[PDB]
Amino acid sequence: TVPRGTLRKIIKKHKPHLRLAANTDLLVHLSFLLFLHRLAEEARTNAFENKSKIIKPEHTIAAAKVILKKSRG
């Protein structure tokens, strides 16, 4: 389950004159899911490196830097 409308709106927020063809919002959503997956693996590795039993802001922030770098088009 997922808010397709929300996707379309998000993209519009950034580029209001971008048109999404009919099912492309679904591939966009997929790329986002894979983004969060990568983020989760990197963050968990950060946590594990600190022997932190929980995921902390700094794990996710360092991980974000790495993964957004991988997410460039």
Partner: protein, 91 residues
Amino acid sequence: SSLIKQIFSHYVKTPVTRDAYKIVEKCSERYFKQISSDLEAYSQHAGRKTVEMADVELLMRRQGLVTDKMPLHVLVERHLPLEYRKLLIPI
């Protein structure tokens, strides 16, 4: 939103602080901003105003997600629910 939490927790498989989640949300906003500019580049470069399937596939190839060993349809089958696979991969 709440959804981003469900997904992130689902993938991370361990407990996550409130602040950590807040970061994930911020970074997600960043993600969409960045890809929005890439998708615009693809469209403008192909002289059109729409995002096509091939554009987002190219995005995901550039991101190292789609590769020769790992074609797009495999990611779709693996990661999206039946109702979406039906639209994306009806054959």
